[PDB]
């Protein structure tokens, strides 16, 4: 494979299985002997590989402390590999649900800052995540949360995941204009981040659990909004709620959100 991001699959070793969900199978292993890596094997026939491989360099050149660090890719062979740093604490959703952790709200707010910093960066690069959620944020050994799987939704082939009315579509993290009119923008990521904050302060509860995905869709349009989690103060709830303005252009930017979050942090 030729390219500044191309990794030699011969430099990879596969040591342990990690899971088989978001866009493909994931393996833990070593890169060049030294570095721990996670290797995501995109399920063969998963998406527009001509399209992904084409507009991959944009994704790969993204660099921020709160984005899971991409080391490279293997695109000559099939399946396509994506190699990242190993995140020892796994997906944020499982991390939140683990009852032995006993979080303080101080830690929850820090998680929200970590992700907001990452999303602020992506916003400044006009790069949409399109599927922000706790299930695809990652946590490292030091408890730092990082954003992952950013932008991959673009190349999904299955209309069950691509179409708003689809079976596997992330309805619960989507705003009205996406569910009705499939309008993805910076403001749809804003909406999703709000639901993520709700996931965090709810310690991993499913949004709108009492409703199915089709019922949730029906209720969002019509003005249903997530209630205030018990662990969320009024100021925290105000922040996440501001992400859910019906009119997209009335929602804040990630710069503003980060500023709000830092003010609350300074108030303890
Ligand atoms: C999550 C469970 C639990 N418990 C869980 O933590 N994981 C599900 C199985 C995969 C695990 N995993 N995936 C990666 C990973 C992700 C994405 C890429 O490639 C990218 C990165 C950025 C942008 C686009 C594409 C590579 C690798 C992991 C890493 N790096 N470390 C550790 N585990 C990783 C996560 C529920 C099923 C409970 C939600
Ligand atoms: Cl803890
Ligand atoms: Cl999408
Ligand atoms: Cl308050
Ligand atoms: Na391990
Ligand atoms: Na950084
Ligand atoms: Na603790
Ligand atoms: Na934290
Ligand atoms: Na999506
Ligand atoms: Na939008
Ligand atoms: Na409420
Ligand atoms: Na309060």
């Amino acid at each position: 494979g030729y390219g500044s991001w191309e990794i030699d699959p011969k430099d990879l070793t596969f040591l342990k299985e990690l899971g088989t969900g978001q866009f493909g199978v994931v393996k833990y292993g070593k890169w060049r002997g030294q570095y721990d890596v996670a290797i995501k094997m995109i399920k063969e026939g998963s998406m527009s590989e001509d399209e992904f491989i084409e507009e991959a360099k944009v994704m790969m050149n993204l660099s921020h402390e709160k984005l899971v660090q991409l080391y490279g890719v293997c695109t000559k062979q099939r399946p396509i590999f994506i190699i990242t740093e190993y995140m020892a604490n796994g997906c944020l959703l499982n991390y939140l649900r683990e009852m032995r952790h006993r979080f303080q709200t101080q830690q929850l707010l820090e998680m929200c800052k970590d992700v907001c910093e990452a999303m602020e960066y992506l916003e400044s690069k006009q790069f949409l995540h399109r599927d922000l959620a706790a299930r695809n944020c990652l946590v490292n050994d030091q408890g730092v949360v990082k954003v992952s799987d950013f932008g991959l939704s673009r190349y999904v082939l299955d209309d069950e995941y691509t179409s708003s009315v689809g079976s596997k579509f992330p309805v619960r993290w989507s705003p009205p204009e996406v569910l009705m009119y499939s309008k993805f923008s910076s403001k749809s990521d804003i909406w999703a981040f709000g639901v993520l904050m709700w996931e965090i302060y709810s310690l991993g509860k499913m949004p709108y659990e009492r409703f199915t995905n089709s019922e949730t869709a029906e209720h969002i349009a019509q003005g249903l909004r997530l209630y205030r989690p018990h662990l969320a103060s009024e100021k925290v709830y105000t922040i996440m709620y501001s992400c859910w303005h019906e009119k997209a252009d009335e929602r804040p930017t990630f710069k503003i959100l980060l500023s709000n979050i830092l003010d609350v942090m300074d108030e303890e």
Side-chain angles (χ1 to χ4, degrees), residues 1 3-9 11-14 18-19 21 24-26 28-33 36-41 45 49 52 56 58-75 77-105 107-155 158 166-167 169-204 206-233 236-246 248-254 256-268:
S4 45
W5 285 112
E6 295 299 320
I7 276 173
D8 187 349
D11 294 339
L12 300 172
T13 70
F14 311 81
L18 292 177
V25 178
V26 184
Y28 164 78
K30 296 288 189 184
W31 184 32
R32 297 185 158 175
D36 303 322
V37 301
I39 306 154
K40 168 167 286 190
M41 303 175 174
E49 290 165 351
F52 163 73
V58 177
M59 185 207 243
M60 294 300 302
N61 289 337
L62 295 171
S63 184
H64 194 270
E65 171 54 34
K66 301 298 169 61
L67 288 175
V68 61
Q69 186 177 357
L70 289 153
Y71 290 157
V73 292
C74 307
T75 196
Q77 56 168 58
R78 293 294 184 274
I80 293 170
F81 288 177
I82 301 189
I83 302 89
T84 59
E85 58 172 328
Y86 175 63
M87 298 295 281
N89 267 316
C91 61
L92 178 64
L93 180 58
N94 183 80
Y95 190 72
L96 288 166
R97 286 173 172 174
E98 173 53 63
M99 67 190 317
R100 282 172 287 183
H101 284 142
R102 312 289 199 197
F103 295 99
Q104 296 166 316
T105 64
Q107 296 166 292
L108 306 178
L109 185 63
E110 178 75 14
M111 294 179 182
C112 295
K113 176 183 64 60
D114 283 347
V115 173
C116 197
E117 285 183 347
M119 294 304 302
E120 166 177 69
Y121 171 78
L122 290 177
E123 177 180 80
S124 75
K125 294 305 194 86
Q126 286 82 40
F127 193 101
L128 302 188
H129 194 302
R130 298 180 148 95
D131 192 22
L132 180 63
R135 69 175 162 273
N136 59 43
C137 289
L138 295 168
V139 185
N140 70 17
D141 58 331
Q142 293 183 347
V144 174
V145 184
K146 297 188 185 193
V147 165
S148 180
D149 286 331
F150 38 93
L152 286 177
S153 284
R154 290 194 304 283
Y155 315 106
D158 196 341
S167 305
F169 191 85
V171 164
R172 296 167 193 268
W173 290 261
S174 289
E177 74 273 6
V178 164
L179 295 165
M180 280 159 63
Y181 302 129
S182 288
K183 288 179 184 171
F184 293 88
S185 68
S186 54
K187 300 299 181 195
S188 57
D189 279 346
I190 290 289
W191 180 289
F193 172 80
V195 183
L196 174 61
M197 288 187 64
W198 186 96
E199 290 190 89
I200 291 169
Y201 276 86
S202 298
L203 302 179
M206 175 178 291
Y208 316 102
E209 200 172 6
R210 66 198 187 279
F211 298 135
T212 66
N213 288 275
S214 61
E215 290 179 327
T216 303
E218 185 203 341
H219 296 328
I220 288 300
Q222 296 185 31
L224 176 63
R225 297 289 185 266
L226 289 162
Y227 57 88
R228 184 173 128 196
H230 286 144
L231 295 168
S233 74
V236 175
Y237 186 55
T238 293
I239 292 172
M240 69 175 69
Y241 199 93
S242 68
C243 298
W244 306 325
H245 280 282
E246 183 76 17
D249 71 326
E250 296 181 17
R251 300 167 199 158
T253 66
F254 280 116
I256 290 170
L257 291 172
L258 178 57
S259 175
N260 302 152
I261 287 174
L262 289 183
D263 286 341
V264 174
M265 197 171 295
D266 189 85
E267 294 173 12
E268 280 76 355

